[PDB]
């Protein structure tokens, strides 16, 4: 889709497989912020968003936290935090036609910079001058959108680039999206390194009498230390106790 109206696909309740990101040859930029690109298969995310669009090549630098430009200001803005990855690849062969490919549009004019992850699909006439527009196109009244006009013989700079932005949400809360990781069996009365659906720690997993309400997934005691957890496969409440330590 055009950058001004970018496609957003929500991803949840799946076994995340990022093999496509590593096996593909087309990708030109594979930037990641807040996560490491190679470690994406060892993480559990609460929810994922895949925002896909087509941009000009020279503007691919604008898809990043804390950047400025026409695309960042008026088309697609990334938040300053942005734990996630931007993947962009040249698509000159697929998104360019002899003559001109004018399907793809961007937003030239807007009253103010759009907030992070905000989409503006309105096509109202922009009032650049003092005179009100009243829906007509005139001297200072302009159509907000503008065609990229992609042609095969263009500088790598002005060639189309397809961009996909993945927005991970990383938190101790129960994560729906996870890597395969081949879950294993669990033992009770041994100090173990446990990975419970993203929760990770070192301790013994005793059987627990905690009464968990169905929506509850783990327990935190005073001072907010995780002391109980329910395993996804069995749905039983286990107390996490740190294995004994002490000065000698």
């Amino acid at each position: 889709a055009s950058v001004y109206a970018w496609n957003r696909k929500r991803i949840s309740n799946c076994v995340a497989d990022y093999s496509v990101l590593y096996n593909s040859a087309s990708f030109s930029t594979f930037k990641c912020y807040g996560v490491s690109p190679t470690k994406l298969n060892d993480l559990c995310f609460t929810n994922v968003y895949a925002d896909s669009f087509v941009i000009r090549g020279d503007e691919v630098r604008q898809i990043a936290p804390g950047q400025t430009g026409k695309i960042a200001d008026y088309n697609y803005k990334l938040p300053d935090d942005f734990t996630g990855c931007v993947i962009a690849w040249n698509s000159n062969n697929l998104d360019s036609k002899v003559g001109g490919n004018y399907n793809y549009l961007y937003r030239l004019f807007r009253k103010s910079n759009l907030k992070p992850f905000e989409r503006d699909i309105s096509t109202e006439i922009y009032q650049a001058g003092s005179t009100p527009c009243n829906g007509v196109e005139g001297f200072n009244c302009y159509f907000p959108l503008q065609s990229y006009g992609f042609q095969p013989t263009n500088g790598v700079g002005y060639q189309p680039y397809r961009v996909v932005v993945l927005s991970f949400e990383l938190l101790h809360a129960p994560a729906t999206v996870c890597g395969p990781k081949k879950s294993t069996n669990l033992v009770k009365n041994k100090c173990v390194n446990f990975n419970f659906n993203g929760l990770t720690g070192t301790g013994v997993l005793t059987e627990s009498n905690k009464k968990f309400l169905p929506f509850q997934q783990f327990g935190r005691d005073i001072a907010d230390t995780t002391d109980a957890v329910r395993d996804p496969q069995t749905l039983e409440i286990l107390d996490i106790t740190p294995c004994s330590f002490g000065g000698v």
Partner: antibody
Amino acid sequence: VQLQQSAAELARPGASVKMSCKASGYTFTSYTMHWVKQRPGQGLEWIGYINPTSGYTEYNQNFKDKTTLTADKSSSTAYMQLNSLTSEDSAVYYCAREGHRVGPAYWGQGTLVTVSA
Amino acid sequence: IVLTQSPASLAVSLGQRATISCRASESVDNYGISFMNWFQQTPGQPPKLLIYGSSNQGSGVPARFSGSGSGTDFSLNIHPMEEDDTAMYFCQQSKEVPYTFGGGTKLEIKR
């Protein structure tokens, strides 16, 4: 890298054809051997490959029943056996050596099998 | 994998660009590299490896031949067309076990 083949074998329908590919210029024990079929003035169809060191042969689904691949490392030669010939089988067969991550990389001339009574 | 080869009959005069295109049903890229190969066959001769991989050039291949593209779309370009380029050009995939070739393009010099 040179591959040498038989020359223009003719057989009646229902018979079997035994096809040879002598290999020279390399070890022949480190590269798998592929076979490709080409009907006259038509496209190329991959038949199957054989590993010379261990006789693990993998064939195309179309050619699985009527084709058998074997290899002799002592004389550094490969063989394809075509069984139950039909008029469709009349074509040029090529023996190729693996290379550059291509299956049929280095081709050896080409031998024409003509099926007719 | 099914490879469809656009123009399969191309007539270009000497010294002019010649483009033969291959499109794949599924992705051909794997392990980071691409596995689309271009073969050339002069009449009465075995096919010869022209472009192994997406862009790497085969042994004894002039700089005229160039391979480009990725994913499912690849192109073979011959800008300095010569007399010797009259041949049948195939596109082949090496990603999956059944190796499949393109439709084939008979390249002719225009007059």
